[PDB]
Amino acid sequence: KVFGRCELAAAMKRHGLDNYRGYSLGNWVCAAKFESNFNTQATNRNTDGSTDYGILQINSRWWCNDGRTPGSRNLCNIPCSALLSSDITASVNCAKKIVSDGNGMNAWVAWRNRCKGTDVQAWIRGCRL
Ligand SMILES: [Cl-]
Ligand SMILES: [Cl-]
Ligand SMILES: [Cl-]
Ligand SMILES: [Cl-]
Ligand SMILES: [Cl-]
Ligand SMILES: [Cl-]
Ligand SMILES: [Cu+2]
Ligand SMILES: [Cu+2]
Ligand SMILES: [Cu+2]
Ligand SMILES: [Cu+2]
């Protein structure tokens, strides 16, 4: 599923990401925009052989099991395919664990490089949530 901007904002807020760990809703929408372009089916191979999955490009090196990432963990206790669903629950639950792991949203390199410090409220402008 490719979410609309406002549609995703609404869904993220319904799933409790708004202000989760102090990160406003616009931070999460911004991250999803630059990680996946709001596409729940996005997958991308990394240099280390892991793969990123879903709307928030969660990495198989720590967070999910894809069966092909040697030496990796599965800290969200899910198959990486669960992160590609039209239903964003598994991605949200796993993101909540990631953003609580010590470095906040810096875990998402694209959030650090493209969202951090910007006017992220723009991402929820005009939205019926
Ligand atoms: Cl957009
Ligand atoms: Cl915001
Ligand atoms: Cl593996
Ligand atoms: Cl392994
Ligand atoms: Cl959803
Ligand atoms: Cl609402
Ligand atoms: Cu709330
Ligand atoms: Cu990544
Ligand atoms: Cu893994
Ligand atoms: Cu709502």
Map out the domains of the chain with their CATH numbers.
Answer: 1-129 (1.10.530.10)
9-35 per-residue burial string, b: 16 or more CB within 10 A, e: under 16 = bbbbbebebbebeebbbbbbbbbbbeb
What's the CA gap between 51 and 68, in Å, rounded?
Answer: 9
Q: Which residues are annotated as a binding site for substrate?
A: 101
Q: What is the resolution of this structure in A?
A: 1.4
Determine the distance separating the centroid of ligand 8 and the alpha carbon of 50, expressed in angstroms: 9
Are the CB atoms for 21 and 99 separated by under 8 Å?
A: yes
Determine the distance separating the centroid of ligand 9 and the alpha carbon of 34, expressed in angstroms: 23
Q: How far is CA 11 from its chain centroid?
A: 13
User: Please, what sign has the CA dihedral across residues 43, 44, 45, 46?
Assistant: negative
Active site residues: 35, 52
What do you get for the CA distance between the two ends of the chain, in Å?
18
Determine the distance separating the centroid of ligand 10 and the alpha carbon of 29, expressed in angstroms: 14
